[PDB]
Design a protein around this ligand. Structure first.
Ligand SMILES: *[C@@H]1O[C@H](CO[C@@H]2O[C@@H](C)[C@@H](O)[C@@H](O)[C@@H]2O)[C@@H](O[C@@H]2O[C@H](CO)[C@@H](O[C@@H]3O[C@H](CO)[C@@H](O)[C@H](O)[C@@H]3O)[C@H](O)[C@H]2NC(C)=O)[C@H](O)[C@H]1NC(C)=O
Ligand SMILES: C[C@H](N[C@H](C(=O)O)[C@@H]1CCCN1C(=O)c1ccc(N)cc1)C(=O)N1CCC[C@H]1C(=O)O
Ligand SMILES: *[C@@H]1O[C@H](CO)[C@@H](O)[C@H](O)[C@H]1NC(C)=O
Ligand SMILES: [Cl-]
Ligand SMILES: [Cl-]
Ligand SMILES: [Zn+2]
Length: 571
């Protein structure tokens, strides 16, 4: 038992050093993709793998059955998983090279007129957000898939084989089993199934109403009122959030809405301003400010020196309890303001659990890490708070704001659900490289009710064109996040003494809400996630009832509206 204590202590001190070095090299590559940063990264990969092997080998000689202290038990059990460092050295090197090649391919892909070349951020993002011409949206949508997704296909089978091989060498049946294990919830699949089924009323009614509005704008010949919606018309490259087509679907055009983009730009907002407001919200709650070093080291806008960066927004823990950063190619708009909050939530979790042993430095489950920033950003998005930031100035405005929120939060529920339904079946072998793309579109249809605007061909690998796929980042966390963040907003709003509809709550400055969040985050991964759930919400389960309560007046409005139009929900 004393041997077990000393071992975790040695694991902890040596992990800080090694993960700090790795984090450094990974940072330098992400913020400066060059031959040399690649090389140093791949080298630090071998270094952290040697550490993992050394300590993971030692960890496995402990019979944790026979260990009394439950924290030591749990750390040791976690270190017995070597992840990719279980692979023989040749496969390990090939695996790391595959990952690097996939990320790089995604992050440097461009789509060119025969003409100039557009990058995903900001050019193609802005095309999907703002264009209202079917054929220009199609060009951006198809081009991105031709350039990024097809180019990832040559790597993916070998990725799958190596990640699964690592999984099995750690005791899992395949990589998807390994990922699901991180929730420590054996009823996960069924729990999330029932959660998704509870949001079906709202999603199908939202889907039908947006479909009708698309029919009105793009014409009856391009929208089948009883079919799936074409995937390039929702204002976003993956149709994962639909809030960029608010203009087409406004419930009450009579209550005109403020152009928040123009307002930000006109009022001189910058990426730094955006992050300072998120920092403000957190300290308003009496949560932690980000350190001075955060502001000197983060990369908050896309470099202008022609350097290739990984633009995709991400939060960075350097594992030393002091160095925390964000790397985002921030655009000045409300969409990225929300992303800035998102990322700031991941910084706040890193700062909150910085005194735990590094093995327990994660969220209660990955969903909790994604949820923190979003919970704040729900209050940021209210008319009350946007008014205060000078970005906005009735029942009508109310239903409009709920519509604006539903286009982001409700629409992403089936997307966030489907991504790992597909990858779990890739990992378990029931989808092969012969039908990657066809099974992806069957789930796109089945869960989101979307169809590809152009028939896909052999050689297409559309999943490759979404960041988390080449980057090998689990996605079910986002589904868990979207459910639980409403539970957290509901409990925080109650802690804050809010009364009346949940959607009017704004927890800004609430020290009561902050303390609930802080005590949960301070747990890191030290206990099963139900305890952190119970600390925030007073009960231990995930539940869609808070999200349903938030959207209830919109659900009533959508049913009245869709009923009077005779919509046939579904496809
Ligand atoms: C099981 O073991 C855990 C972990 O033990 C800690 O790490 C081991 C590897 C050894 O190095 C131990 O010496 C070491 O304590 C025990 O958890 C620890 O318990 C103490 C309370 O005794 C916690 O200390 C607190 O720290 C806060 C904030 O810094 C102070 O304000 C408090 O007033 C208090 O002193 C410590 O956080 C906690 N550590 C973790 C990471 O959980 C655990 O108590 C033990 N269980 C049994 C069965 O005794
Ligand atoms: C832009 C956002 N970016 C991700 C993210 O912040 O989740 C980035 C990349 C992968 C994970 N991530 C991190 O920064 C991270 C760092 C440490 C963690 N412990 C957890 C995450 C995102 O993809 N998102 C946000 C919501 C939807 C999803 C998406 O855009 O597809
Ligand atoms: C970018 O990478 C090169 C190659 O490793 C390095 O020499 C240089 O200092 C880095 N420059 C920037 C912009 O950080
Ligand atoms: Cl797609
Ligand atoms: Cl996950
Ligand atoms: Zn996140």
């Amino acid at each position: 038992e004393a041997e077990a204590s000393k071992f975790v202590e040695e694991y902890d001190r040596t992990s800080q050093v090694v993960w700090n070095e790795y984090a450094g090299a990974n940072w330098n590559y992400n913020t400066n993709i060059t031959t040399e940063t690649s090389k140093i990264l791949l080298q630090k990969n071998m270094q952290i793998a040697q550490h993992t092997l050394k300590y993971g080998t030692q960890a496995r000689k402990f019979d944790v059955n026979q260990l009394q202290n439950t924290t030591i038990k749990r750390i040791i059990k976690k270190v017995q998983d070597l992840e990719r460092a279980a692979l023989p050295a040749q496969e390990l090197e090939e695996y790391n090279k595959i990952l690097l090649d996939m990320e790089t391919t995604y992050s440097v892909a461009t789509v060119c007129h025969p003409g100039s070349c557009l990058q995903l951020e900001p050019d193609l993002t802005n095309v999907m957000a703002t264009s209202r011409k079917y054929e220009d949206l199609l060009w951006a949508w198809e081009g991105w898939r031709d350039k990024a997704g097809r180019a990832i296909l040559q790597f993916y089978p070998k990725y799958v084989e190596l990640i699964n091989q690592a999984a099995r060498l750690n005791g899992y049946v395949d990589a998807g089993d390994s990922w699901r294990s991180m929730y420590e919830t054996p009823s996960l699949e069924q729990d999330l199934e029932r959660l998704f089924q509870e949001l079906q009323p709202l999603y199908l009614n939202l889907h039908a109403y947006v479909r009708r509005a698309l029919h009105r704008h793009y014409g009856a010949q391009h929208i089948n009122l009883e079919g799936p919606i074409p995937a390039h018309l929702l204002g976003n490259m993956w149709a994962q959030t639909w809030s960029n087509i608010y203009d087409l679907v406004v419930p009450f055009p009579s209550a005109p809405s403020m152009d928040t983009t123009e307002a930000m730009l006109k009022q001189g907002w910058t990426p730094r301003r955006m992050f300072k407001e998120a920092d403000d919200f957190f300290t308003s709650l009496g949560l932690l400010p980000v350190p001075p070093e955060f502001w000197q080291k983060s990369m908050l806008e896309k470099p202008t020196d022609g350097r290739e960066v990984v633009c995709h927004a991400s939060a960075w823990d350097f594992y030393n309890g002091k160095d925390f950063r964000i790397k985002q190619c921030t655009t000045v708009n409300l969409e990225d303001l929300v992303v800035a909050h998102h990322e700031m939530g991941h910084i706040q979790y890193f700062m909150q659990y910085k005194d735990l042993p590094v093995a327990l430095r994660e969220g209660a489950n990955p969903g909790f890490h994604e949820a923190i920033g979003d919970v704040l950003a729900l209050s940021v998005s209210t008319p009350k708070h946007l008014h205060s930031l000078n970005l906005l100035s009735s029942d009508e405005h109310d239903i409009n704001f709920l519509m604006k929120m539903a286009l982001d939060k409700i629409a992403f529920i089936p997307f966030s659900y489907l991504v790992d339904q597909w990858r779990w079946r890739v990992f378990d072998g029931s989808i092969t490289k012969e039908n990657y793309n066809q099974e992806w579109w069957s789930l796109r249809l089945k869960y989101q009710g979307l169809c590809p605007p152009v028939p896909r061909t052999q050689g297409d690998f559309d999943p490759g064109a979404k960041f988390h796929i080449p980057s090998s980042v689990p996605y079910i966390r986002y589904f868990v996040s979207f459910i639980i963040q409403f539970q957290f907003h509901e409990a925080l709003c109650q802690a804050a003494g809010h009364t009346g509809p949940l959607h009017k709550c704004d927890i800004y400055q609430s020290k009561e809400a902050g303390q609930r969040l802080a005590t949960a985050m301070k747990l890191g991964f030290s206990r099963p996630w139900p305890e952190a759930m119970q600390l925030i919400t007073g009960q231990p389960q995930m539940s869609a009832s808070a999200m349903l309560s938030y959207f209830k007046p919109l659900l009533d409005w959508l049913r009245t509206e869709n009923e009077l139009h005779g919509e046939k929900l579904g496809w």
